[PDB]
Short mmCIF file of C-alpha atoms and ligand atoms in Angstrom, two decimals:
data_model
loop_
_atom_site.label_atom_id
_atom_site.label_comp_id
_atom_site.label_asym_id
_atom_site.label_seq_id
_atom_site.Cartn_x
_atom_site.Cartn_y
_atom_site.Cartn_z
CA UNK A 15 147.81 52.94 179.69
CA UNK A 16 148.30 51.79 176.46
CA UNK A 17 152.25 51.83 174.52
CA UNK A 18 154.02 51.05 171.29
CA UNK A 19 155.75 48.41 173.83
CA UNK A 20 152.80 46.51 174.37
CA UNK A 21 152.75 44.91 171.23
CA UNK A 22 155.11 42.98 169.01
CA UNK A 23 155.74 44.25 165.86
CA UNK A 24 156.14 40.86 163.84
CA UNK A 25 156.83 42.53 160.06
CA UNK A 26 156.87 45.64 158.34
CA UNK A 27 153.60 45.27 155.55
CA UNK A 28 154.70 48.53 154.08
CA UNK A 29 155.64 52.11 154.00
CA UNK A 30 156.11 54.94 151.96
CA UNK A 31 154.03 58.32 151.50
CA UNK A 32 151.93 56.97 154.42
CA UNK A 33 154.45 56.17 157.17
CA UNK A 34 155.37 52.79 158.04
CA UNK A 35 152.30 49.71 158.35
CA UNK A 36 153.41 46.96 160.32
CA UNK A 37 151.43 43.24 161.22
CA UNK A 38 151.58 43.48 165.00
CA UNK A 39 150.28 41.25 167.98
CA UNK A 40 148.91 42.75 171.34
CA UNK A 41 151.00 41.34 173.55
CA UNK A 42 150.53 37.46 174.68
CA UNK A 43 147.09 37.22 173.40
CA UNK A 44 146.77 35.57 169.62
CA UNK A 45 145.76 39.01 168.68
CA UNK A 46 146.56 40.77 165.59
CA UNK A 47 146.03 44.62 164.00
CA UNK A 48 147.86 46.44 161.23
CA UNK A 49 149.88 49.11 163.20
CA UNK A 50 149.92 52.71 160.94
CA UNK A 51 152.73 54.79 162.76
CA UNK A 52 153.91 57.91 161.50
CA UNK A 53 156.72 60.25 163.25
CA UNK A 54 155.42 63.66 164.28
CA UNK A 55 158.17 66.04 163.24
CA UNK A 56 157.89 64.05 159.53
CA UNK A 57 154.40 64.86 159.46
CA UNK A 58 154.48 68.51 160.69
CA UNK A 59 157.13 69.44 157.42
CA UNK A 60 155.05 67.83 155.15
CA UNK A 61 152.52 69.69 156.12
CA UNK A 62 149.89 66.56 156.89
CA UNK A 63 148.60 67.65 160.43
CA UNK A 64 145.47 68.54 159.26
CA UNK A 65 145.12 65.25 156.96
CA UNK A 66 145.82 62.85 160.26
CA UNK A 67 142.53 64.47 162.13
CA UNK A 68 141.27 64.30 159.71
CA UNK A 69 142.12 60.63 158.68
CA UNK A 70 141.83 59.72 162.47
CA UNK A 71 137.95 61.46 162.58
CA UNK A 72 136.89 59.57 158.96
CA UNK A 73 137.69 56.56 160.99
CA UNK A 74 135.72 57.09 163.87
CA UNK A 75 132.83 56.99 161.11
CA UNK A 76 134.03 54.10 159.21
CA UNK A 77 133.37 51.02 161.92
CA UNK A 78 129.22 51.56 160.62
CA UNK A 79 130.65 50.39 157.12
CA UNK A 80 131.97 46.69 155.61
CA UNK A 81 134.31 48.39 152.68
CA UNK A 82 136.22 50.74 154.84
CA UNK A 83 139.40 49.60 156.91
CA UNK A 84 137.66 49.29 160.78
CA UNK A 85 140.20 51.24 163.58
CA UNK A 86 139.91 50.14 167.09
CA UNK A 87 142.32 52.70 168.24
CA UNK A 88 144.85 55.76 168.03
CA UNK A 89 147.43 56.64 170.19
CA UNK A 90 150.21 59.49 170.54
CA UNK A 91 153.47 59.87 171.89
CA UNK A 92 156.01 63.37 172.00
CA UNK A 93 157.24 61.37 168.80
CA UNK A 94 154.89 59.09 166.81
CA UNK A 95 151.16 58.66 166.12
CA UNK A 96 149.38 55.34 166.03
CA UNK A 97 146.35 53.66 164.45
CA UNK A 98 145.78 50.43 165.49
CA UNK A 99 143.79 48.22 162.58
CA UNK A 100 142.17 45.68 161.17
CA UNK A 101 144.79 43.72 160.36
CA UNK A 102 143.34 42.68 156.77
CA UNK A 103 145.87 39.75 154.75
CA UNK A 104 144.14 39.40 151.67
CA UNK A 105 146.28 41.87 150.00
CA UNK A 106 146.07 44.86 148.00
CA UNK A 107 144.43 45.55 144.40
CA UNK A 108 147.51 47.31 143.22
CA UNK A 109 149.99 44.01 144.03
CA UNK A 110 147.35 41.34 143.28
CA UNK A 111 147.08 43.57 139.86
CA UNK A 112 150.74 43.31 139.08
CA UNK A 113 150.83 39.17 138.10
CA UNK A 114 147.72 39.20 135.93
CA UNK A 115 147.68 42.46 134.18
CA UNK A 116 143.94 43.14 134.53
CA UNK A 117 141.06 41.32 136.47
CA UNK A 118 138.79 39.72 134.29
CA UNK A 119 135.00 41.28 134.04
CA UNK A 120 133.29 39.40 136.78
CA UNK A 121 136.14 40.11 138.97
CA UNK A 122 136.46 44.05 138.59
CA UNK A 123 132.66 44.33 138.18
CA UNK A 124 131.98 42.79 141.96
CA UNK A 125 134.79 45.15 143.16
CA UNK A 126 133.26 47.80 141.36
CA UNK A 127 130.51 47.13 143.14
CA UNK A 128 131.73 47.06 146.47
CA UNK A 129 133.63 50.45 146.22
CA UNK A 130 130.82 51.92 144.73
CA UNK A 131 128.70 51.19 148.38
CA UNK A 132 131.87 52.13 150.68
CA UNK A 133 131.95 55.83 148.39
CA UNK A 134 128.47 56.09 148.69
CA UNK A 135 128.50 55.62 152.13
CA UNK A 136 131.21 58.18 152.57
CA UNK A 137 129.28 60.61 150.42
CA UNK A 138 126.07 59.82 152.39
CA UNK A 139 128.45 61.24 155.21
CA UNK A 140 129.25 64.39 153.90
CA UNK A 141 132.81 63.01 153.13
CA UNK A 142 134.29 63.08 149.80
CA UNK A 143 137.66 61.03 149.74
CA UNK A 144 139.46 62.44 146.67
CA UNK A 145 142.29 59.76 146.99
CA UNK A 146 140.36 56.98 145.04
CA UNK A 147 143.07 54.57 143.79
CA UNK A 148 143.74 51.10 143.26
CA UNK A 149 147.40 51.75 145.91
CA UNK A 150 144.07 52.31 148.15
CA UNK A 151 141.93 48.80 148.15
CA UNK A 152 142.97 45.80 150.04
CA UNK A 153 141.53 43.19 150.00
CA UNK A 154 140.23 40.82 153.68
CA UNK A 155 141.02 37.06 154.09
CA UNK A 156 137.57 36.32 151.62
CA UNK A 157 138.21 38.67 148.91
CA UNK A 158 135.95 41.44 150.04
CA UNK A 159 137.20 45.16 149.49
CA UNK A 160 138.18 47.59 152.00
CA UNK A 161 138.95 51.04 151.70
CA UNK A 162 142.10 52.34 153.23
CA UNK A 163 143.93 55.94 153.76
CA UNK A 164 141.21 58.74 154.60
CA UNK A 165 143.47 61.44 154.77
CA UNK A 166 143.05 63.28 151.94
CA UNK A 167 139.05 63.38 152.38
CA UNK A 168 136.98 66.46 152.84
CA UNK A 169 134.50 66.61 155.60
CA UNK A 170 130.78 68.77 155.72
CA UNK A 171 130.50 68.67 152.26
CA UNK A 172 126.62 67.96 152.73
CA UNK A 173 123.88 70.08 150.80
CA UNK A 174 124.80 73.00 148.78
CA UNK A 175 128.63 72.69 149.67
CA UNK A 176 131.62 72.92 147.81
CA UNK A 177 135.84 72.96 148.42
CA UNK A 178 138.78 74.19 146.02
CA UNK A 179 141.72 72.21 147.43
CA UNK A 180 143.99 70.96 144.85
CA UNK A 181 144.55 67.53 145.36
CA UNK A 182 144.67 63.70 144.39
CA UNK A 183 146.95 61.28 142.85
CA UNK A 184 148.22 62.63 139.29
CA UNK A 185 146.34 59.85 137.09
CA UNK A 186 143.16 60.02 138.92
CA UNK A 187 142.49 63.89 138.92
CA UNK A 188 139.37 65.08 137.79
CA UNK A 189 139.21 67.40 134.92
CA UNK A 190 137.41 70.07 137.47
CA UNK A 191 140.40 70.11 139.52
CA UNK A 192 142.76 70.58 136.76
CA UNK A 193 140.65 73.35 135.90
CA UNK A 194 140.20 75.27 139.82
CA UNK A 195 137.10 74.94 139.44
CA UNK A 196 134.94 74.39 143.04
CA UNK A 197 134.18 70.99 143.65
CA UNK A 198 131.74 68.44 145.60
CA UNK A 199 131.89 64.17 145.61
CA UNK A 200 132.00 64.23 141.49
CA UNK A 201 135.70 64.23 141.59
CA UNK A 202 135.53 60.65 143.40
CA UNK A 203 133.37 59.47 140.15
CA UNK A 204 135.57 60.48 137.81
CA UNK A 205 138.46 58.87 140.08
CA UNK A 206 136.69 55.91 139.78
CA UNK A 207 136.04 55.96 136.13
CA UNK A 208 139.88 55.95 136.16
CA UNK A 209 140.24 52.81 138.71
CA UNK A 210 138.02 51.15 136.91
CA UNK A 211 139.21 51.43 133.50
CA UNK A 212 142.52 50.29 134.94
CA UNK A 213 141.04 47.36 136.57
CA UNK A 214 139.80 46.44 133.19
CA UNK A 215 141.85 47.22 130.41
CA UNK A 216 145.40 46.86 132.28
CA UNK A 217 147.06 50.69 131.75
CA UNK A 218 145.88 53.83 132.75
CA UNK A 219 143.11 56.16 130.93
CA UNK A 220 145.30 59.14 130.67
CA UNK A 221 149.18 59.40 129.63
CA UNK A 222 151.87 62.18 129.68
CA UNK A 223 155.84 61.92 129.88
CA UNK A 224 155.12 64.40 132.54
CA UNK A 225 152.43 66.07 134.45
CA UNK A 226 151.77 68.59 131.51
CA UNK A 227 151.28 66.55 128.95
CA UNK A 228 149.14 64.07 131.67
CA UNK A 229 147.42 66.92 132.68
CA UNK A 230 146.46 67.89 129.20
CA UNK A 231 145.39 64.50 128.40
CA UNK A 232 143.40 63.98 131.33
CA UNK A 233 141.04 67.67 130.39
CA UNK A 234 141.24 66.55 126.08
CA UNK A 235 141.61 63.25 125.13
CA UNK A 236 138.79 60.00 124.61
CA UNK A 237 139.83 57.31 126.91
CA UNK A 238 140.73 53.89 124.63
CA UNK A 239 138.30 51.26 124.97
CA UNK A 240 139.42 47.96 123.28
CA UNK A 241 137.24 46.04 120.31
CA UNK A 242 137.40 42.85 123.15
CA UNK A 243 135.68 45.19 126.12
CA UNK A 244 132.45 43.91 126.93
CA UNK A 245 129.79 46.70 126.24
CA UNK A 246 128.25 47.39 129.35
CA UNK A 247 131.49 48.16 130.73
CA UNK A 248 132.61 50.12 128.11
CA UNK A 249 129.00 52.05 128.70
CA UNK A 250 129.25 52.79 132.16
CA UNK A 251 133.09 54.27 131.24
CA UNK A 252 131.57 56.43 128.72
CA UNK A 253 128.94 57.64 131.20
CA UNK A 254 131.91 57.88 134.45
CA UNK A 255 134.49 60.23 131.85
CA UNK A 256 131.70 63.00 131.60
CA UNK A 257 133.50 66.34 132.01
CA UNK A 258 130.74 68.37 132.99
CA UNK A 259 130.61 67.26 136.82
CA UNK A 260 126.96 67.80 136.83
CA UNK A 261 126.07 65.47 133.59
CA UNK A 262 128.67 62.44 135.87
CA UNK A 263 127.00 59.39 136.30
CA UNK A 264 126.91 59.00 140.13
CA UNK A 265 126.13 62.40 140.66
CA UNK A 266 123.03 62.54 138.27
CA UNK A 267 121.36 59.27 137.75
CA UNK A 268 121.46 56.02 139.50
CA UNK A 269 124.98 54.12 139.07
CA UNK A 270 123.41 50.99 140.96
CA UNK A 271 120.38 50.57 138.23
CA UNK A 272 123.59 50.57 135.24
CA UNK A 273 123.37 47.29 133.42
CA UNK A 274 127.05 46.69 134.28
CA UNK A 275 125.13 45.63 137.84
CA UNK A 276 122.39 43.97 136.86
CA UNK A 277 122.98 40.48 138.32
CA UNK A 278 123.77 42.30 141.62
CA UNK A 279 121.44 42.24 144.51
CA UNK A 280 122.98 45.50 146.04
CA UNK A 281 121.53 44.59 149.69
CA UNK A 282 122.75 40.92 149.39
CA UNK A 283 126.25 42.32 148.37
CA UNK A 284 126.23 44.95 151.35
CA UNK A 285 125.58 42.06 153.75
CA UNK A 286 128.98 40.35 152.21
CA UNK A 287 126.65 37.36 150.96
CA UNK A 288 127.55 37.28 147.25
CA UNK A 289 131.29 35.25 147.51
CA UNK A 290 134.16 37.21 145.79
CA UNK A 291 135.03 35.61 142.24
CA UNK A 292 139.15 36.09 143.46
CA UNK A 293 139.75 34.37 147.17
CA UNK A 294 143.08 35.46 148.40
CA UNK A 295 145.36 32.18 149.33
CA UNK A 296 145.86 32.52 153.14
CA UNK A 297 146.99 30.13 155.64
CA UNK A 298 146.23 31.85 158.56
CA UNK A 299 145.26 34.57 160.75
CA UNK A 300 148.65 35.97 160.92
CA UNK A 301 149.77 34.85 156.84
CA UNK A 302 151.30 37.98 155.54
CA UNK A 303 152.48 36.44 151.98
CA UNK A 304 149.85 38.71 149.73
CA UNK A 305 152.28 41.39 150.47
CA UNK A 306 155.25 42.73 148.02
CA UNK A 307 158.24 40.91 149.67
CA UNK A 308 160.22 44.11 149.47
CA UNK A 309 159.11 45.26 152.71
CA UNK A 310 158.64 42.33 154.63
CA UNK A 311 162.33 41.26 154.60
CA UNK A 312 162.94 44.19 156.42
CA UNK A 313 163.41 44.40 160.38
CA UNK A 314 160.89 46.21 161.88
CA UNK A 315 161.84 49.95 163.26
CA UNK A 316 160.26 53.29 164.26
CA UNK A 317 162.84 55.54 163.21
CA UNK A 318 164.35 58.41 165.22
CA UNK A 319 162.31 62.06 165.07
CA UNK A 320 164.21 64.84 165.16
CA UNK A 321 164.26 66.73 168.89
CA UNK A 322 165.00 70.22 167.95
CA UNK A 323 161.33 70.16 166.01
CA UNK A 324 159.81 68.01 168.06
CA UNK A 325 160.66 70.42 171.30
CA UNK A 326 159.61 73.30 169.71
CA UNK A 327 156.56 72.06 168.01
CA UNK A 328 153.09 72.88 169.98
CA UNK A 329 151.58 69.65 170.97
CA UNK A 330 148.49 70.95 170.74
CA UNK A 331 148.36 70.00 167.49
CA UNK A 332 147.11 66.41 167.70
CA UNK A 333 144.63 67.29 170.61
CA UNK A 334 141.72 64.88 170.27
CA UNK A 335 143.84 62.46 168.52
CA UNK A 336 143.58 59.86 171.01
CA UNK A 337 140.85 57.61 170.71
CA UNK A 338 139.85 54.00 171.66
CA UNK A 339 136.52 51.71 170.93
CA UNK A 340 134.74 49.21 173.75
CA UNK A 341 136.08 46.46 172.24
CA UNK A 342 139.64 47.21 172.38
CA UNK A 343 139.04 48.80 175.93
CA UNK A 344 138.24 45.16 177.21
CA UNK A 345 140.78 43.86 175.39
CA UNK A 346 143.00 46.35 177.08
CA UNK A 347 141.71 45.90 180.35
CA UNK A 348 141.61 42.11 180.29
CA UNK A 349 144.96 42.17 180.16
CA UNK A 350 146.16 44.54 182.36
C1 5VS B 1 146.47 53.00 151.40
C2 5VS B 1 147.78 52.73 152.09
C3 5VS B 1 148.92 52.75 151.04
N1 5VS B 1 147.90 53.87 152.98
C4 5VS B 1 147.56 53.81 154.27
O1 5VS B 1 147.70 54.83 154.90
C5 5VS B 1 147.11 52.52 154.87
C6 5VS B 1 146.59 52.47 156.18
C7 5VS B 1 146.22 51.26 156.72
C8 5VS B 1 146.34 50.08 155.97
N2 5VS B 1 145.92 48.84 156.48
C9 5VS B 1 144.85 48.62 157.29
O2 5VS B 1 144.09 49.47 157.72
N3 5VS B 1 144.74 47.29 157.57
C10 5VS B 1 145.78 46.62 156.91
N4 5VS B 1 146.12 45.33 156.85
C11 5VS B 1 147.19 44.92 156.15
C12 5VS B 1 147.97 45.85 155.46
C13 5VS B 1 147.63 47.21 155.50
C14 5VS B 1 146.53 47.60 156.23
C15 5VS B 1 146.82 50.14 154.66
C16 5VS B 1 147.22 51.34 154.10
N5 5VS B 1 147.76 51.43 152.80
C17 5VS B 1 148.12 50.27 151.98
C18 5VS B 1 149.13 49.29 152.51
C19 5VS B 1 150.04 49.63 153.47
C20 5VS B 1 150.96 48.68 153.93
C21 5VS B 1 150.93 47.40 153.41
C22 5VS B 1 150.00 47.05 152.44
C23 5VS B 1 149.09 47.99 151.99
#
């Protein structure tokens, strides 16, 4: 059944690291979904087949959770892979960032918030993500936050477990990591320490002219915290840049009861019933404009894979990759 073919790929949203995203339609219907496709023989040399099951089985878990970008299905071809999304238009933290230089307190403390319940769901899970970012929140059509890319995540990472993969986004590393040490969830606290502080203040916590000196700032140096930065917030920084991963607020302690939080009702927020302080301007279902412009004046493509590696590559790798909910089905079906 289902094919590339049977939708319309109406813009490309983005690409980069992560493939190519594009704002798609299911054929007639007034449907729409974010399209993640990503060539095979690109993802075999850069060694990421691991990180698509992976990515692919995080998302089976996701749907139980508000924060976390919802996938209805995945598909494969002898050249591409497919998840089929939530096609979510408020934009991304990382663009909306880029006009007004920080979000003001309200603002970054009710996404805060929200990321703090999607990560401790995951964790809850036996997940750790270890990719935490702002490149890595989007934001739906009301301003709520949704958490997007699970490939770099860890799974079984429940009780007395631990992993010693080197990995992350430069800025965001935690200080265990830079020093091999074996890690659980901690790392995504002091990941979000860094978000955070960049939500906030504007730059990033840690600075090198290359990964050395970064590297060296990120296991040495205070973090800068402003005369203007509200105390609480500088307080729950102070208690988020804790080396010792044990002595990390969010693994010891209860990040929910800091003061930071203490006009949120935690079970009101889960329910999306506290309105986002920033509503994205949309139009309409289908409105891609909080998106950089870069990308979307470009035709949509899937580029050509290349047949020698694709030939003589077992297939076998993305067994199981295939996977599709109810809902979709009778979409699907409905239309058949
Ligand atoms: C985190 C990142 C960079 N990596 C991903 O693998 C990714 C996967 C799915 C979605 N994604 C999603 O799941 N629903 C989306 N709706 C609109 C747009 C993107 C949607 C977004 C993803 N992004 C960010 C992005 C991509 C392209 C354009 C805007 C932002």
């Amino acid at each position: 059944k289902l094919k590339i073919e049977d939708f319309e790929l109406h813009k490309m949203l983005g690409k980069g690291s992560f493939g190519k995203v594009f704002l798609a339609e299911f054929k007639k219907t007034n449907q729409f979904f974010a399209i993640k496709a990503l060539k095979k023989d690109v993802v075999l040399m850069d060694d990421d087949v691991e990180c698509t099951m992976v990515e692919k089985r995080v998302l089976s878990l996701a749907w139980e959770h508000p924060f976390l970008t919802h996938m209805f299905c995945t598909f494969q071809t002898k050249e591409n892979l497919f998840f089929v999304m939530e096609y979510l238009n408020g934009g991304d933290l990382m663009y909306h960032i880029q006009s007004c230089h920080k979000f003001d307190l309200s603002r970054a403390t009710f996404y805060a918030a929200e990321i703090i319940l999607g990560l401790q769901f995951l964790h809850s899970k036996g997940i750790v993500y270890r990719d935490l970012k702002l490149d890595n929140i989007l934001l739906d059509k009301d301003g709520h936050i949704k958490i997007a890319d699970f490939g770099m995540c860890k799974e079984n990472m429940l009780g007395d477990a631990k992993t010693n993969e080197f990995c992350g986004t430069p800025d965001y590393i935690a200080p265990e990591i830079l020093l091999g040490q074996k890690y659980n969830h901690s790392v995504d606290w002091w990941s979000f320490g860094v978000l955070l502080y960049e939500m906030l203040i504007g730059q990033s916590p840690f600075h090198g002219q290359d990964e050395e000196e970064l590297f060296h700032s990120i296991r040495m140096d205070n973090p800068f915290y402003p005369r203007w930065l509200e105390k609480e917030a500088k307080d729950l920084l102070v208690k988020l840049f804790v080396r010792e991963p044990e002595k990390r607020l969010g693994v010891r302690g209860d990040i929910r009861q800091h003061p930071l939080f203490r006009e949120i009702n935690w079970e009101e927020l889960e329910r999306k019933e506290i309105d986002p302080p920033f509503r994205p301007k949309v139009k309409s279902p289908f409105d891609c404009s909080n998106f950089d412009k870069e990308f979307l004046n470009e035709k949509p493509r899937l580029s050509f894979a290349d047949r020698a590696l694709i030939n003589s590559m077992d297939q076998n790798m993305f067994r199981n990759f295939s996977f599709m909910n109810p809902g979709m089905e009778r979409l699907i079906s409905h239309h058949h």
